Design a protein around this ligand. Structure first.
Ligand SMILES: CCCCCCCCCCCCCCCCCC(=O)OC[C@H](COP(=O)([O-])OCC(O)COP(=O)([O-])OC[C@@H](COC(=O)CCCCCCCCCCCCCCCCC)OC(=O)CCCCCCCCCCCCCCCCC)OC(=O)CCCCCCCCCCCCCCCCC
Ligand SMILES: CCCCCCCCCCCCCCCCCC(=O)O[C@@H](COC(=O)CCCCCCCCCCCCCCC)COP(=O)(O)OCC[N+](C)(C)C
Ligand SMILES: CCCCCCCCCCCCCCCCCC(=O)O[C@@H](COC(=O)CCCCCCCCCCCCCCC)COP(=O)(O)OC[C@H](O)CO
Ligand SMILES: CCCCCCCCCCCCCCCCCCCC(=O)O[C@H](COC(=O)CCCCCCCCCCCCCC)COP(=O)(O)OCCN
Ligand SMILES: CCCCCCCCCCCCCCCCCCCC(=O)O[C@H](COC(=O)CCCCCCCCCCCCCC)COP(=O)(O)OCCN
Ligand SMILES: CCCCCCCCCCCCCCCCCCCC(=O)O[C@H](COC(=O)CCCCCCCCCCCCCC)COP(=O)(O)OCCN
Ligand SMILES: CCCCCCCCCCCCCCCCCC(=O)OC[C@H](COP(=O)(O)O)OC(=O)CCCCCCCCCCCCCCCCC
Ligand SMILES: CCCCCCCCCCCCCCCCCC(=O)OC[C@H](COP(=O)(O)O)OC(=O)CCCCCCCCCCCCCCCCC
Ligand SMILES: CCCCCCCCCCCCCCCCCC(=O)OC[C@H](COP(=O)(O)O)OC(=O)CCCCCCCCCCCCCCCCC
Ligand SMILES: COC1=C(OC)C(=O)C(C/C=C(\C)CC/C=C(\C)CC/C=C(\C)CC/C=C(\C)CCC=C(C)C)=C(C)C1=O
Lengths: 286, 59, 157, 84, 104, 105, 64, 54, 194, 134, 116, 71, 65
């Protein structure tokens, strides 16, 4: 029954990832006064499936100067971690569920760094360290935000936890600036605009590349569900769609930062703000 | 310069640091001074349960 | 209980494997596998939070520093006498005597112990850390301060 | 607006120059220091809480609900002249 | 050996208000015995009295108001022994079977 | 003669003893670099941490968990300082040593 | 625009149907709509006692 | 090669998972045997001390 | 009641104020820090109890601070003094381990920091060797403490496992034949740390 | 895992309980509360799926051998990695505080902990170590 | 076997350093706050606070004048030594109030209705 | 806080009933074990059935139903 | 404290040297002790419980049939 529940979870995750990448193309097109994919299937509804099948019959490039095992292992590790994080969202009852998902998302750094070590490109090694530095820098603000969230999460028996079923079903109006910081931290983790300067998958083709992008979009959906649980009073389909629309909307209208600019932002703005909010919420919670 | 000029120049040249220190100070000050002035203030199992039922039955 | 005992016994294999291989990258990969497997072993004992701390600190933070240092400092010299010099037979004899036969075990005269799962309470841990062992908590903070200042002073300029 | 700030300067020599000297106060294209409480709150609501990102977001959301300029080739064509 | 047991956890939670209002003396004796003596042999009569006094009360409720007790205990079972999700069933059961003997 | 819990406990203790001696000896025995020596020191710390957590569960006692947190803190601080010193020494001596981080050659 | 509406509707429908199916499957596995709640040591003790006493009631039923 | 290394790792893991429990079982059997010898020697000493101690 | 612990709160408050004062002094470009050293010596006197051995250590460290000149070195010596003072009051292996490890980390970092000239790499080399040799002795201490804790169920330092703890203590004093880390340290590290 | 003693089975005798436990369905409301067992199965299943994704284009795709197709087309990270290590340890320390209903002396002890943290952080800020110009 | 039902909302009343004494003098207040500690402090405590502050000012002026920064060094050193003395004096007053030190002066001043 | 206080009160009511039920079951299991031991060791010279090991304090079983491994 | 100790001399001399671990644990955690019940009370209580069972104001040992 656990294997059945996990496969029944896995099916809409992949279907949703295909529909997310189509919806990103089409919403980005509608903001730019065009159409986006319409030809490939009726209303363009077959475009992600033909992208996946095109990459399926695409030639796998295995460079004969790299280490083949780590090269194969990097997108597998990314994909596996995304699927495991989704299972932790929906098929768990653990006491420290948010800490579990934070631990899983801290493991997601390895696919980037294994891709940087494996492929023998000069600037893949240069960009992997930058991407890892960005993700590493914003993980701390995510953790301090979780500290602020957990100060008010108590179940019926009186025990404090990070269990998702014990979270309240009303929006957390008291933590609006922390919610905004959380959303920009999600944007920084997924390497989206305005942090998309670093790429690391420059040597990958066919289904290894497809695994990289499925992992990226599934991680975006994980973080969207986490933000909707923590701040928006629950996990729902409408909230997932609205937050995804917001992320595409921000990608349509903004330019990106330099490397040192978002490093200064994450180490001089977001971390002191989350720590100061934690101290204020701890003072309130007494 | 006085408090006002130095504060305005500091918050104009670096607002996030000043606002972070203000949030931290508000929390520390509320727990130190504001909380202990306004908000701060063997029966058997049968009396405790009777009180719980009395609190439940009116609402 | 075959898979649980096998998962327990896998940690010693990975501990040997860290030093056995000639590739520094593969040594770090073995260490990451070992720390993930040990975090799952600690959760057989009933510890949920401390296993997550194991994962988050060692795999999430420290192994990234290891991989950056290795990838920045290791031009391939596995042929350059890392294979051509072999290993030490005296050290292998010491390992066999002390860790396989275990002539000086930690249980001493006892040879059998009943493993018992716990029930971790984080309220008890919070009470202990912030009331009963508070001086040790502050001295741990001072050690972390030593680490931060000392690294930033020792950073190569 | 096209105004400048000490801190929003993209380089390092000007960042070092604005935090160690008040030569930027002579330049007329810079935004002046706030003088009272309400001006400080306006400056903080500019820096924190964004509101400059939001104007661009409102424009792009208006464009999301606007008309499109795409033609459906080869069922629809462009426009040419007899001199083509 | 004889089979000794008390009702299930949702039934125990559903009947826990009547235990202190109708079997208080057995509860007091069991608490005092466990405070004084650690060996389970030394507190056998009071343990047996408390078990039998709980089971007699469970037999009383099923004779007087079985359907209200069954729906309330099923509600407590469904929602993980959270009392705040079954206030209406609790009110109906306490109306059918009072905690203390009323109008006496 | 013995139960499944006794097999589980004795297997845990045998595993951690072999882990401790593997971390103490093996990287030195195989003539590895200072980076791998620091990794093996982390293996030693992991063996001690697992022993403390096993004992804390075994006695129903809090002191093993306190020791676990402390061990993680001290081990990470020492490892970070050692890696910084390794990088500094490598940049100071690579012009004449090539194999500078290997002192067991 | 009108071209972006079908994909955005389909994402919502996919997640609605998938969450409904996963809910029905896990409800069949657990038989109570509070299986995902936080449980402390007392609640774990209560569930384990309930399971073992249910097994005992099954064992005693197949003897009469 | 990659297939050779994956096969060698799988072989080492399976061989370790089958061979070490025999080492542990032999060690526990030796401890049980020595403990039973200690129990019998203690009983012998107790009988001797009861015999000449009244 | 925490009224019996004002010296600990004073220690922490003094460290918090001293870091901020050292930061403010360095923002002025002061190339000497005798005022910081005097405040460090005052802090050393203010946290030391009224025993003979405690004050012997205190007066010794006040005299030693006159040979150190940077802010970071003074901070490392103060945080090594905290371990040196509180090890004399340690009645367990928990506090024993933490005090010894704080002292080892401070010594390693100071050996890295203060070297100059052609002897820089020799000092860093000897500091690395000392750190590696110290790590395994710390592991031995932790391992046999875990053994003692499992056997006795308490924090008493009795039984056969105290022999290995004694060997840990003999390592920290440079007792032969575990003496060669100190012999390596004497040949390269500067005279003030010696 | 199955219970190996009569005390672990709440003193229920018989052979029906042993077989019923060994062949039980996984249940968070039975014997497997807070279990973390679905995390392992998810890893196994997802590793199977990604391996099938890796292997399949070696069968159903064209391939041509070429020597050019198989060819290639700072200290700030040390700062970030070591600072992230120390700050992650500090957040892990702060997590048992937030999971308790803390009294006032616990609050002031935690604030002393945070004060030491932010004092070291503010020293590194003031010396210009968080300005990533190099 | 069956554990005690945990009380999540009640924390133990425990200070990390335990005195291991019984008081040998009359107990006025077993748990005085900071206002209680300052309002029953003796004059010798204020004298040693002012002496420490003055010595700190003079020595800070001497050491801060070598880098031409004498006045802020004097102010900081004065505050540093003065807070050390103030913590000492408050602790002494609280120990007299709790009964661990001689409090004949304090018993005849802190109990206006329980004077004699 | 009100919900937690109610649940704590109910748990305090139920705890002696459960401990009593545990005690009676433990006694019955001990009786069965003593019958089995008396059947096994009847011919052994000097063996005593039912010899408690400790002298003053009762010893609970090491293992219990409520503590199980997670994975 | 839990890992540190401080020793000071009693000015009056009216303090007795004991084990500070035992004193610390007595103040911090306490010490629980029990006694064996007198057997006559056990048979008296067993007789009273048997009489309460026979007279009908006590139930059975199981809720089942
Ligand atoms: C946080 C990080 C992210 C991870 C979490 C994510 C969640 C999990 C997702 C799963 C991962 C997805 C992708 C998997 C990779 C697929 C394989 C691949 O591409 O090739 C690897 C490939 C092999 O290297 P290579 O490129 O061919 O050679 C380069 C080296 O220089 C060559 O080095 P070398 O030649 O020196 O090494 C040779 C070695 C090569 O090792 C490997 O092949 C890699 C080993 C691990 C890979 C596991 C993947 C599947 C392999 C089969 C597993 C079978 C085990 C049993 C299963 C049952 C089957 C019957 O083979 C051996 O000969 C091993 C010798 C054994 C030890 C000997 C010492 C003791 C002697 C004592 C007596 C002997 C008895 O590179 C890697 O090892 C990449 C590492 C990344 C793997 C994931 C890390 C985590 C693993 C899961 C968690 C651990 C839990 C423990 C459970 C069981 C253990 C696994
Ligand atoms: C390590 C190598 C793989 C080991 C795989 C293994 O142990 O298989 C497991 C786990 O593996 C699987 O069952 C999944 C097989 C993976 C491949 C499936 C592909 C997707 C369809 C067997 O599960 P069961 O005992 O049948 O399930 C127990 C009952 N319960 C459902 C409640 C968990
Ligand atoms: C620029 C610096 C100036 C410093 C001096 C001025 C600032 C004032 C000093 C700070 C406050 C006074 C000192 C502490 C007062 C404790 C006395 C007390 O009882 O106060 C409260 C005690 O609570 C606290 O605030 C306790 C503080 C705990 C501090 C814990 C950490 C101690 C230090 C550990 C360091 C470890 C050692 C490191 C080296 C190994 C509660 O009062 P009450 O009992 O009357 O109220 C009862 C109420 O219900 C709450 O209890
Ligand atoms: C031939 C011999 C082969 C020996 C292999 C030994 C090592 C086993 C590694 C995992 C094998 C997976 C399948 C085995 C079944 C399994 O999960 O076993 C569990 C033991 O835990 C374990 O085995 C724990 C190891 C888990 C490592 C996987 C790491 C995943 C990393 C992903 C990140 C996770 C983030 C944190 C949540 C308990 O099984 P049971 O008895 O309960 O099952 C049946 C009752 N239902
Ligand atoms: C859906 C996705 C939502 C996000 C869409 C927009 C993405 C914007 C990305 C770029 C943001 C730039 C940014 O964060 O700038 C910082 C200011 O804003 C922030 O720091 C913003 C986050 C914090 C919100 C405000 C927090 C304080 C509010 C009041 C708290 C106190 C009262 C209530 C308790 C620092 O830029 P800077 O110029 O300020 O840097 C000072 C030194 N140059
Ligand atoms: C949780 C909340 C976290 C808040 C983080 C605050 C970061 C403080 C770093 C400030 C460093 C910048 C700096 O140079 O500050 C100087 C003093 O600031 C200070 O001394 C401020 C110290 C604040 C301690 C908290 C300004 O004055 P300066 O020394 O540069 O001026 C005379 C020389 N031109
Ligand atoms: C940077 C800015 C940070 C902002 C920080 C905001 C802090 C907000 C604190 C809000 C406190 C909770 C809201 C009111 C609930 C009180 C509960 C209560 O008394 O229950 C009894 C009672 C309920 O009756 P019952 O049925 O008897 O329980 O409620 C009241 O009496 C509440 C009456 C309203 C009082 C409103 C007070 C507004 C000002 C509070 C302080 C604001 C300044 C603090 C900082 C100053 C500078 C340091
Ligand atoms: C020629 C050699 C001169 C050395 C002077 C020895 C003075 C010893 C004084 C000890 C004393 O009275 O105890 C004070 C005091 C103990 O008496 P209390 O004041 O009652 O605690 O302890 C100290 O302050 C000890 C001072 C130790 C000085 C360093 C050790 C020798 C150098
Ligand atoms: C901002 C800079 C960081 C502030 C926190 C750094 C130190 C961490 C806090 C240590 C607290 C020690 C006990 C405080 C206490 O009992 O205050 C209650 C106490 C209650 O007020 P009362 O009515 O006067 O007893 O508050 C105070 O009077 C002190 C105000 C808090 C000041 C904390 C920092 C002390 C040095 C400056
Ligand atoms: C501007 O942003 C974008 C990109 O740049 C970042 C892109 O690169 C792409 C293109 C890349 C894509 C679409 C690859 C990632 C997605 C995949 C592979 C789809 C996953 C879908 C699955 C597994 C379900 C399909 C399989 C089915 C139905 C099974 C069929 C079986 C049978 C018929 C038997 C897009 C669309 C995009 O917008």
């Amino acid at each position: 029954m656990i294997v059945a529940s996990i496969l029944i979870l896995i099916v809409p995750v992949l279907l949703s990832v295909a529909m997310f990448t189509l919806a990103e193309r089409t919403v980005m097109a509608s903001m730019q006064r065009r159409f986006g994919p319409q030809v490939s299937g009726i209303s363009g509804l077959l475009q992600p499936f033909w992208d996946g099948l095109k990459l399926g019959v695409k030639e796998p490039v295995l460079p004969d100067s790299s280490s083949a095992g780590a090269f194969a292992a990097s997108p597998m590790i990314s994909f596996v971690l995304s699927q495991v994080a989704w299972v932790g969202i929906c098929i768990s009852d653990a006491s420290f569920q948010g800490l579990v998902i934070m631990a899983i998302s801290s493991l997601a750094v390895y696919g980037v760094m294994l891709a940087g070590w494996a492929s023998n490109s000069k600037y893949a090694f240069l960009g992997c360290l930058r991407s890892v530095a960005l993700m590493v820098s914003y993980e701390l603000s995510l953790g301090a935000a979780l500290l602020s969230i957990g100060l008010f999460v108590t179940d019926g028996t009186g025990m404090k936890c990070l269990n998702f079923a014990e979270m309240p079903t009303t929006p957390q109006y008291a933590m609006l600036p922390l919610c905004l910081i959380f959303l920009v931290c999600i944007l920084a983790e997924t390497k989206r605009d305005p942090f998309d300067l670093p790429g690391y998958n420059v040597e990958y083709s066919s289904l290894g590349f497809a695994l990289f992008f499925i992992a990226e979009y599934a991680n975006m959906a994980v973080m969207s569900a986490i933000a909707s649980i923590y701040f928006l009073g629950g996990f729902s389909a409408l909230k997932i769609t609205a937050l995804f629309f917001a992320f595409v909307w921000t990608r349509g209208t903004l330019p990106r930062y330099r490397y040192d600019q978002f490093m200064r932002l994450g180490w001089k703005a977001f971390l002191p703000l989350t720590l100061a909010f934690f101290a204020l919420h701890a003072s309130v919670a007494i | 310069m006085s408090l006002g000029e130095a504060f305005r120049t500091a918050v104009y040249k670096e607002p996030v640091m000043v606002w972070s220190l203000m949030i931290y100070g508000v929390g520390i000050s509320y727990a130190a001074f504001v909380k202990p002035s306004m908000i701060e203030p063997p029966p058997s199992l049968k009396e405790v349960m009777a009180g719980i039922q009395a609190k439940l039955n009116n609402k | 209980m075959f898979f649980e005992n096998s998962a327990i016994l896998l940690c010693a294999l990975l501990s040997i494997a860290v030093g056995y291989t000639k590739s520094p990258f593969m040594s770090l990969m073995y260490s990451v596998m070992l720390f993930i497997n040990s975090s799952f072993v600690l959760m057989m004992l009933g510890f949920e939070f401390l296993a997550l701390v194991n994962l988050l600190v060692y795999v999430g933070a420290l192994a990234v520093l290891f991989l950056f240092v290795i990838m920045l400092l290791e031009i391939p010299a596995t042929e350059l006498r890392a294979y051509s010099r072999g290993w030490s037979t005296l050290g292998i004899f010491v390992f066999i005597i002390n860790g396989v036969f275990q002539i000086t075990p930690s249980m001493g005269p006892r040879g059998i112990i009943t493993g018992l799962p716990g029930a971790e309470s984080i309220t008890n841990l919070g009470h202990a850390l912030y009331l009963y062992f508070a001086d040790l908590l502050i001295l741990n903070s001072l050690v972390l301060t030593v680490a931060l200042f000392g690294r930033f002073a020792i950073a190569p300029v | 607006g096209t105004e400048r700030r000490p801190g929003e300067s993209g380089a390092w020599k000007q960042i070092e120059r604005q935090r160690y000297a008040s030569d930027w106060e002579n330049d007329p294209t810079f935004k002046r220091t706030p003088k009272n409480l309400a001006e400080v709150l306006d400056d903080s609501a500019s820096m924190l809480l964004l509101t400059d990102v939001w104007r661009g977001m409102a424009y792009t959301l208006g464009a999301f609900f606007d008309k499109k300029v795409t033609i459906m080739y080869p069922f629809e064509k462009g426009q040419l002249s007899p001199r083509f | 050996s004889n089979t000794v047991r008390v009702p299930y956890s949702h039934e125990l939670y559903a009947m826990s208000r009547h235990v202190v209002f109708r079997a208080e003396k057995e509860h007091k004796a069991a608490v005092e015995c466990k405070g004084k003596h650690d060996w389970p042999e030394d507190c056998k009569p009071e343990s047996e009295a408390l078990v039998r006094a709980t089971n007699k009360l469970y037999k009383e409720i099923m004779e007087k108001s079985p359907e209200e007790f069954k729906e309330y205990a099923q509600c407590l079972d469904w929602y993980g022994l959270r009392f705040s999700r079954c206030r209406d069933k609790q009110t109906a059961f306490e109306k059918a079977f009072p905690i203390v003997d009323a109008k006496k | 003669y013995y139960t499944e819990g006794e097999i589980f406990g004795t297997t845990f203790m045998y595993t951690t003893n072999m882990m401790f001696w593997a971390g103490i000896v093996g990287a030195v025995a195989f003539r590895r670099n200072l980076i791998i020596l620091l990794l093996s020191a982390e293996t030693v710390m992991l063996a001690c941490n697992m022993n403390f957590l096993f004992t804390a569960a075994y006695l129903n006692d809090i002191t093993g968990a306190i020791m676990s947190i402390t061990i993680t803190t001290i081990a990470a601080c020492e490892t970070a300082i050692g890696l910084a010193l390794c990088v500094a020494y490598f940049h100071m001596r690579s012009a004449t040593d090539v194999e500078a981080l290997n002192m067991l050659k | 625009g009108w071209n972006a509406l079908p994909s955005l509707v389909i994402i919502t429908g996919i997640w609605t149907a998938g969450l409904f199916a996963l809910d029905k499957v896990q409800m069949f596995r657990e038989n109570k709509p509070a299986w995902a709640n936080n449980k402390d040591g007392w609640q774990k003790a209560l569930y384990r006692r309930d399971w073992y006493l249910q097994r005992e009631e099954e064992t005693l039923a197949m003897a009469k | 090669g990659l297939i050779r290394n994956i096969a060698t790792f799988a072989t080492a893991v399976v061989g370790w998972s089958v061979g070490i429990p025999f080492v542990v079982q032999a060690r526990m059997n030796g401890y049980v045997e020595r403990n039973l010898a200690t129990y019998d020697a203690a009983q012998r000493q107790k009988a001797e001390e009861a015999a000449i101690g009244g | 009641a925490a009224a019996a612990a004002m010296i600990e709160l004073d220690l922490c408050f003094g460290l918090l104020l001293l870091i901020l004062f050292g930061l403010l002094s360095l923002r002025n470009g002061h190339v000497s820090l005798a005022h910081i050293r005097f405040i460090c010596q005052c802090w050393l006197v203010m946290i030391t109890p009224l025993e003979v051995q405690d004050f012997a250590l205190c007066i010794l460290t006040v005299v030693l601070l006159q040979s150190f000149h940077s802010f970071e070195a003074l901070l490392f010596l103060l945080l090594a003094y905290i371990g040196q003072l509180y090890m004399m009051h340690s009645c367990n292996l928990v506090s024993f381990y933490v005090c010894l490890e704080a002292q080892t980390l401070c010594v390693v970092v100071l050996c890295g920091l203060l070297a100059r000239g052609a002897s820089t790499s020799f000092s860093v080399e000897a500091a690395l060797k000392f750190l590696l040799l110290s790590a395994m002795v710390s592991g031995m201490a932790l391992f046999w403490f875990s053994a003692m804790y499992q056997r006795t169920g308490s924090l008493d330092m009795v039984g056969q496992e105290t022999f290995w703890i004694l060997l840990v203590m003999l390592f920290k004093l440079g007792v032969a034949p575990m003496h060669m880390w100190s012999v390596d340290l004497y040949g390269s590290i500067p005279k003030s740390l010696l | 895992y199955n219970a190996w003693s009569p005390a672990q089975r709440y003193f229920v005798e018989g052979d029906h309980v042993v077989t019923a436990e060994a062949s039980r369905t996984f249940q968070f409301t039975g014997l497997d509360s807070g279990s973390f067992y679905p995390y392992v199965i998810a890893t196994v299943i997802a590793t199977a799926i990604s391996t099938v994704f890796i292997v399949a284009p070696l069968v159903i795709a064209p391939s041509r051998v070429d020597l050019d197709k198989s060819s290639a087309y700072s200290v700030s990270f040390y700062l970030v990695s070591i600072m992230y290590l120390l700050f992650d340890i500090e957040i892990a320390y702060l997590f048992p505080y937030a999971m308790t209903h803390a009294s006032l002396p616990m609050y002031w002890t935690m604030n002393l902990f945070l004060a030491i943290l932010v004092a070291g952080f503010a020293y590194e800020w003031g010396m210009g170590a968080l300005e990533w110009r190099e | 076997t069956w554990p005690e039902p945990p009380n999540y909302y009640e924390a133990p009343k425990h200070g990390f350093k335990v005195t291991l004494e019984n008081p040998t003098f009359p107990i006025i207040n077993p748990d005085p706050n900071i206002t209680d500690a300052v309002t029953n402090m003796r004059s010798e405590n204020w004298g040693v606070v002012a002496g420490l502050a003055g010595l700190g000012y003079v020595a800070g002026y001497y050491f801060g004048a070598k880098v031409h920064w004498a006045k802020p060094t004097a102010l900081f050193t004065s505050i540093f030594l003065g807070k050390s003395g103030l913590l000492w004096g408050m602790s002494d007053s609280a120990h007299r109030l709790m009964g661990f030190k001689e409090n004949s002066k304090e018993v005849a001043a802190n109990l206006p209705h329980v004077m004699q | 806080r009100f919900e937690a206080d109610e649940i704590l009160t109910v748990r305090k009511i139920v705890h002696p009933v459960l401990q009593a039920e545990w005690d009676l079951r433990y006694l019955e299991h001990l009786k069965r074990e003593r019958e089995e031991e008396a059947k096994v060791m009847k011919n052994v010279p000097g063996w005593k059935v039912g010899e408690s090991t400790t002298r003053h304090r009762w010893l609970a079983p090491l293992e219990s139903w409520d503590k199980r491994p997670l994975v | 404290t839990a890992g540190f100790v401080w020793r000071e001399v009693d000015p009056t001399g009216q303090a007795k040297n004991r084990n500070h671990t035992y004193m610390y644990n007595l103040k911090t955690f306490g010490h629980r002790s029990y006694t064996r019940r007198d057997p006559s009370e056990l048979q008296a209580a067993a007789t009273s419980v048997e009489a309460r069972v026979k007279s009908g104001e006590l139930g059975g040992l199981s809720p089942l049939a």
